[PDB]
Design an enzyme around this catalytic site. Structure first.
Site, PDB file in Angstrom:
ATOM      1  CG  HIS A  83      -2.012  -1.032   1.153  1.00 28.22           C
ATOM      2  ND1 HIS A  83      -2.848  -1.175   0.065  1.00 28.22           N
ATOM      3  CD2 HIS A  83      -2.373  -1.993   2.034  1.00 28.22           C
ATOM      4  CE1 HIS A  83      -3.681  -2.177   0.284  1.00 28.22           C
ATOM      5  NE2 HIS A  83      -3.412  -2.692   1.469  1.00 28.22           N
ATOM      6  CG  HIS A 131      -6.672  -5.190   1.345  1.00 26.23           C
ATOM      7  ND1 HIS A 131      -6.268  -6.253   2.121  1.00 26.23           N
ATOM      8  CD2 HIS A 131      -7.761  -4.669   1.955  1.00 26.23           C
ATOM      9  CE1 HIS A 131      -7.089  -6.381   3.148  1.00 26.23           C
ATOM     10  NE2 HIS A 131      -8.002  -5.427   3.074  1.00 26.23           N
ATOM     11  CG  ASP A 163      -5.283 -10.085   2.948  1.00 26.42           C
ATOM     12  OD1 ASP A 163      -4.820 -10.636   1.927  1.00 26.42           O
ATOM     13  OD2 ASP A 163      -5.194  -8.857   3.151  1.00 26.42           O
TER      14      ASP A 163
END
Ligand SMILES: NCCCNCCCCCB(O)O
Ligand SMILES: NCCCNCCCCCB(O)O
Ligand SMILES: [K+]
Ligand SMILES: [K+]
Ligand SMILES: [K+]
Ligand SMILES: [K+]
Ligand SMILES: [Mg+2]
Ligand SMILES: [Mg+2]
Ligand SMILES: [Mg+2]
Ligand SMILES: [Zn+2]
Ligand SMILES: [Zn+2]
Lengths: 346, 343
Positions: free
Chosen positions: B160, B198, B285
């Site tokens: 990120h 993500h 995840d």
């Protein structure tokens, strides 16, 4: 002295959040209902003038300033937050960082970030209703001045001057000063000046009128290199397009006293005089106070009498909208001193 | 065969608070994550385990700006010196309509350099971010010098982080740093495939205008989940980089039978790119029991993922990203490595 009317909402705790992110902790909020209670009690104790409750104008005049999507978001934000299963008050966690897209998402967390500039402004039950009432408080005051009063005091809470057309933050949701200024414009007042004397930059009011020459926006405030809002408020921001030279930022450093701040006030008054507006909106904060817990100016309570006197000498129809000021001990003395100095006390 | 690089310094990052749903909660990106993976690596005897070499800030600064690296080193001390009592969390940021302008106060700098308030900084965060980048760079070195693949057991994660933005538990973009190291060592083309639940927005942003590093991410729909403001399928690059970024988005409850269709699309894009090296930003995840994510992969699906990655036939660095069910995180992550090696 003279008499000035004050508009207030009796439900001081309609907005009643219990958390504010500050220094990495969730503290009790600085912008508390006792702010409005204390000012109202000093209005009464000093017999400033008539006290009245707001008229309901609906969202029409609010939407002359704020976008439809933003006004809808604020009405549904709490419900949507609760329905998504969050357990705290509604606080943004994620936002449009530099290099990301200014694109409205679906999820409530995404929308919270898209519509905010800070995480210091919790939303909960009553916040929507409180923002609406505060806007109506400003519009009632504007109506009083339009129909003949020289001036009126809009005891707005929550404040407004950090709110953009579609961004909330810094304890503000609807930009009450900009709504009153635009109401003057809509009622045939050719030119309006908005003068922001709260310790912080009125970035929301600057943004709303930034490309317009019919509304002059001026703010005195602490250096945004040092203090909120950090990313607007510098003196090189003078407007854009037709609004070039119709925005003026005047910045001061820590510990600035009235003797120096008042020189900036004189500069602002000279700019107002050349502009020659037809009405004046004063976004009034008393967080310039020497004991304010989150600000670094050094005005004394007696200085607010001088401020009100100097504002009256501009000779304009004037609406005061209450913004910041967080030493509740003195907030009533300080804010009412401005109205009393405007009315002749000093 | 497959070696793992691990730094005990990761534990210097041990924050006590995470903003989540309006409350300060126990953080998801916790030290037991790396320790549970490491224990599974030893228990399965996956391969040799080594500590990182110190590569210095040079290779970090091939990707991240000098001001941002400087900010991360002093942020905590500046925060304490300004009298704040909690951990370091941004409160104010560059809202829409405001200036992307660096201020002097620590609060303003925290907001300028961040994309969210979920990533508290405290003492030892700098040290752990530095060691995590060295873990990725040591894994890249092992691959460049002869190993088919290497596992960089990075903590904190990286995908990120932009060149000068932190958030989503990430500070230095470990995958991008290893990718740029391949490029600086004469590998003509590199691909970075992000299988974390993500979007790898940091990696995308870093290479967005470049055609020499192909970035691909599979992830949950950012309309619905973090990072919200990047990761949509219409983001294909810009300038020289258009058509060298590919986002593949999935809705809630997506299982492996659907997710692996996106994986196959990614692999065919890599096949046509023909890279000289591959970096996998590996999050687990995507697991069916992950506490903050909504895919439905099973532990057994991670063996299938690792085997499919091996069939790309490339020098491969795995950098550890997310995965927040600590009970299964060791099994899941090591399953990828074992499926890669033939399990
Ligand atoms: N407590 C944090 C320091 C800066 N935050 C101030 C909140 C918004 C400004 C208040 B106002 O009256 O404009
Ligand atoms: N917890 C709320 C969702 C947003 N926070 C997630 C931050 C990114 C970490 C995930 B990773 O493994 O890429
Ligand atoms: K101001
Ligand atoms: K203007
Ligand atoms: K991903
Ligand atoms: K690219
Ligand atoms: Mg969400
Ligand atoms: Mg006192
Ligand atoms: Mg500060
Ligand atoms: Zn203020
Ligand atoms: Zn993840």
């Amino acid at each position: 002295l003279g008499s000035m009317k004050t508009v207030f909402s009796p439900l001081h705790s309609r907005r009643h959040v219990k958390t504010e992110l500050d220094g990495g902790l969730l503290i009790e909020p600085h912008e508390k209902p006792s702010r409005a209670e204390t000012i109202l009690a000093r209005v009464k104790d000093q017999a400033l003038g008539e006290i009245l409750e707001p008229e309901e104008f609906g969202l029409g005049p609010v939407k002359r300033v704020h976008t439809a999507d933003y006004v809808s978001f604020l009405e549904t934000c709490w419900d949507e937050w609760v329905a998504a299963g969050k357990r705290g008050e509604a606080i943004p966690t994620f936002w449009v960082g530099r290099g990301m897209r200014a694109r409205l998402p679906k999820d409530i967390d995404g929308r919270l970030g898209y519509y905010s500039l800070g995480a210091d402004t919790s939303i909960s039950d009553g916040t929507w209703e409180a923002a609406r009432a505060s806007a109506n408080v400003a519009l009632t005051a504007q109506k009083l001045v339009a129909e003949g009063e020289r001036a009126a005091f809009a005891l707005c809470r929550p404040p407004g001057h950090h709110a953009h057309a579609d961004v909330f933050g810094g304890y503000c949701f609807f930009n009450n000063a900009a709504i009153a200024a635009q109401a003057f414009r809509d009622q045939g007042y050719g030119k309006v000046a908005v003068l922001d004397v709260d310790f912080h930059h009125g970035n929301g009011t600057q943004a709303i009128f930034y490309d317009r020459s019919d509304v002059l926006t001026i703010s005195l405030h602490g250096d945004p290199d040092l203090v909120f809002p950090h990313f607007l408020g510098f003196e090189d921001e003078t407007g854009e397009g037709d609004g070039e030279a119709y925005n003026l930022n005047i910045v001061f450093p820590p510990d600035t006293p009235f003797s120096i701040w008042s020189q900036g006030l004189e500069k602002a008054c000279e700019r107002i005089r050349t502009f020659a507006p037809d009405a004046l909106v004063v976004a009034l904060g008393v967080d310039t106070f020497e004991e304010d817990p989150i600000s670094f100016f050094k005005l004394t309570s007696g200085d607010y009498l001088k401020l009100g006197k100097r504002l009256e000498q501009l000779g304009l129809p004037t609406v005061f909208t209450m913004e910041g000021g967080y030493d509740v001990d003195a907030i009533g003395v300080n804010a009412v001193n401005v109205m009393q100095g405007f009315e002749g006390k000093s």
